[PDB]
Design an enzyme around this catalytic site. Structure first.
Site, PDB file in Angstrom:
ATOM      1  N   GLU A  16       0.796  -1.231   0.000  1.00 12.56           N
ATOM      2  CA  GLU A  16       0.000   0.000   0.000  1.00 12.56           C
ATOM      3  C   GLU A  16       0.841   1.301   0.000  1.00 12.56           C
ATOM      4  O   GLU A  16       1.483   1.633   1.010  1.00 12.56           O
ATOM      5  CB  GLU A  16      -0.972  -0.016   1.217  1.00 12.56           C
ATOM      6  CG  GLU A  16      -1.877   1.237   1.333  1.00 12.56           C
ATOM      7  CD  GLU A  16      -2.558   1.601   0.017  1.00 12.56           C
ATOM      8  OE1 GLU A  16      -3.337   0.779  -0.480  1.00 12.56           O
ATOM      9  OE2 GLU A  16      -2.334   2.703  -0.539  1.00 12.56           O
ATOM     10  N   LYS A  17       0.799   2.041  -1.124  1.00 13.54           N
ATOM     11  CA  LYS A  17       1.501   3.354  -1.270  1.00 13.54           C
ATOM     12  C   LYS A  17       1.149   4.396  -0.213  1.00 13.54           C
ATOM     13  O   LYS A  17       1.932   5.281   0.063  1.00 13.54           O
ATOM     14  CB  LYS A  17       1.266   3.979  -2.675  1.00 13.54           C
ATOM     15  CG  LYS A  17      -0.213   4.316  -3.052  1.00 13.54           C
ATOM     16  CD  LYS A  17      -0.336   4.805  -4.534  1.00 13.54           C
ATOM     17  CE  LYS A  17      -1.581   4.222  -5.278  1.00 13.54           C
ATOM     18  NZ  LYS A  17      -1.292   3.663  -6.675  1.00 13.54           N
ATOM     19  N   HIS A  18      -0.043   4.309   0.358  1.00  9.45           N
ATOM     20  CA  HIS A  18      -0.510   5.324   1.254  1.00  9.45           C
ATOM     21  C   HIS A  18       0.049   5.242   2.664  1.00  9.45           C
ATOM     22  O   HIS A  18       0.022   6.238   3.372  1.00  9.45           O
ATOM     23  CB  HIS A  18      -2.030   5.319   1.307  1.00  9.45           C
ATOM     24  CG  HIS A  18      -2.687   5.899   0.089  1.00  9.45           C
ATOM     25  ND1 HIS A  18      -3.290   5.117  -0.879  1.00  9.45           N
ATOM     26  CD2 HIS A  18      -2.872   7.188  -0.293  1.00  9.45           C
ATOM     27  CE1 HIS A  18      -3.806   5.899  -1.809  1.00  9.45           C
ATOM     28  NE2 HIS A  18      -3.552   7.157  -1.486  1.00  9.45           N
ATOM     29  N   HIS A  46       3.404   7.465  -4.662  1.00  7.73           N
ATOM     30  CA  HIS A  46       2.077   8.012  -4.639  1.00  7.73           C
ATOM     31  C   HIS A  46       2.112   9.297  -5.491  1.00  7.73           C
ATOM     32  O   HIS A  46       3.085  10.055  -5.409  1.00  7.73           O
ATOM     33  CB  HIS A  46       1.683   8.308  -3.185  1.00  7.73           C
ATOM     34  CG  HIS A  46       0.315   8.884  -3.048  1.00  7.73           C
ATOM     35  ND1 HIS A  46       0.019  10.183  -3.407  1.00  7.73           N
ATOM     36  CD2 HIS A  46      -0.843   8.336  -2.622  1.00  7.73           C
ATOM     37  CE1 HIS A  46      -1.269  10.409  -3.212  1.00  7.73           C
ATOM     38  NE2 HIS A  46      -1.812   9.303  -2.738  1.00  7.73           N
ATOM     39  N   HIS A  52      -4.591  15.332  -6.695  1.00  5.37           N
ATOM     40  CA  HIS A  52      -4.373  14.140  -5.878  1.00  5.37           C
ATOM     41  C   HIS A  52      -2.969  14.199  -5.248  1.00  5.37           C
ATOM     42  O   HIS A  52      -1.955  14.190  -5.923  1.00  5.37           O
ATOM     43  CB  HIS A  52      -4.582  12.894  -6.744  1.00  5.37           C
ATOM     44  CG  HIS A  52      -4.341  11.603  -6.033  1.00  5.37           C
ATOM     45  ND1 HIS A  52      -4.014  10.443  -6.700  1.00  5.37           N
ATOM     46  CD2 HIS A  52      -4.376  11.286  -4.718  1.00  5.37           C
ATOM     47  CE1 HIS A  52      -3.853   9.468  -5.824  1.00  5.37           C
ATOM     48  NE2 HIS A  52      -4.060   9.958  -4.616  1.00  5.37           N
ATOM     49  N   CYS A 116      -4.218  11.713   2.790  1.00  7.25           N
ATOM     50  CA  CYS A 116      -4.296  11.976   1.369  1.00  7.25           C
ATOM     51  C   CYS A 116      -5.564  12.788   1.115  1.00  7.25           C
ATOM     52  O   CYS A 116      -6.604  12.527   1.729  1.00  7.25           O
ATOM     53  CB  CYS A 116      -4.321  10.666   0.580  1.00  7.25           C
ATOM     54  SG  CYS A 116      -4.643  10.923  -1.209  1.00  7.25           S
ATOM     55  N   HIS A 119      -7.960   9.929  -0.405  1.00  6.70           N
ATOM     56  CA  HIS A 119      -7.940   8.553   0.079  1.00  6.70           C
ATOM     57  C   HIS A 119      -7.829   8.488   1.568  1.00  6.70           C
ATOM     58  O   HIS A 119      -7.424   7.478   2.101  1.00  6.70           O
ATOM     59  CB  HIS A 119      -6.771   7.768  -0.534  1.00  6.70           C
ATOM     60  CG  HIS A 119      -6.940   7.481  -1.993  1.00  6.70           C
ATOM     61  ND1 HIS A 119      -6.040   7.896  -2.940  1.00  6.70           N
ATOM     62  CD2 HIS A 119      -7.924   6.851  -2.669  1.00  6.70           C
ATOM     63  CE1 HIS A 119      -6.451   7.523  -4.135  1.00  6.70           C
ATOM     64  NE2 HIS A 119      -7.581   6.863  -3.992  1.00  6.70           N
TER      65      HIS A 119
HETATM   66 FE   LIG Z   1      -4.048   8.992  -2.450  1.00  2.00          FE
END
Ligand SMILES: [Fe+3]
Ligand SMILES: [Fe+3]
Lengths: 132, 132
Positions: A16-18, A46, A52, A116, A119
């Site tokens: 997961e990038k977040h 990300h 974004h 984010c 997100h």
């Molecule tokens: Fe994001």
């Protein structure tokens, strides 16, 4: 039963990038300056676009045996290519990585929280030991 | 004639502990990740107590030929030894140094602004050149 926790996600930063990834020593001396690096998008990058982007990283310290968490800091990343010429035409982008420096006198847990713009909220944590 | 500028101080960081000191390369490549380190109390240390501390450092970018400044970020240092046991008995202190990472596509000026809880606002700046 409406809790913020229901909307704070954790995952393996490998998947997961977040997820904010903490890099900090495992054990430190009491009162010495400790460097804590937190990065979102450590393994999977990300996006950083006007539409974004990662807004901020926050660090908390939870001293072992204390009832509370303490806000070490909030680190806002505020440039994402916005311009009067249009979105993503700007001169500057702030990447979601930060190095903060703390002095600890007790072992505890470092908690990283990131946000984010589309997100939501993401967290990770890592134990840190203090010695004389 | 009431301006914030009248209360934003600049000095030689060699003389004045309160001046934020920018460390950043003089010239960078377009879109590469550039590390900018800003420290208050680089040469003369500044206190970090519950009663007296540096609250934050903010970084601005002024693109050459642009009419505006852009907020790169705000970096808040939020732990200063506060505790239910009393002031300066706490487990954690956040030191007023931060590393932020930016991508630039145009030369400009890095402007650092810092705030002390009792001694106001302080600034410095440094030019940065961008190339292909
Ligand atoms: Fe994001
Ligand atoms: Fe001061």
């Amino acid at each position: 039963h409406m809790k913020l926790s229901d909307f704070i996600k954790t995952e393996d930063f490998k998947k997961e990038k977040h997820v904010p990834v903490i890099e900090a020593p495992e054990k430190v001396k009491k009162d010495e300056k400790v460097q804590i690096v937190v990065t979102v998008g450590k393994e999977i990058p990300h996006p950083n676009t006007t539409e974004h982007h990662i807004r901020w990283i926050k660090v908390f310290f939870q001293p072992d045996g204390d009832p509370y968490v303490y806000e070490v800091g909030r680190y806002e990343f505020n440039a994402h290519g916005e311009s009067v010429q249009g979105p993503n035409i700007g001169a500057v982008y702030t990447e979601p990585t930060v190095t903060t420096v703390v002095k600890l006198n007790r072992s505890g847990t470092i908690i990283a929280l990131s946000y984010c713009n589309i997100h939501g909220l993401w967290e990770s944590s890592q134990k840190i030991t203090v010695e004389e």
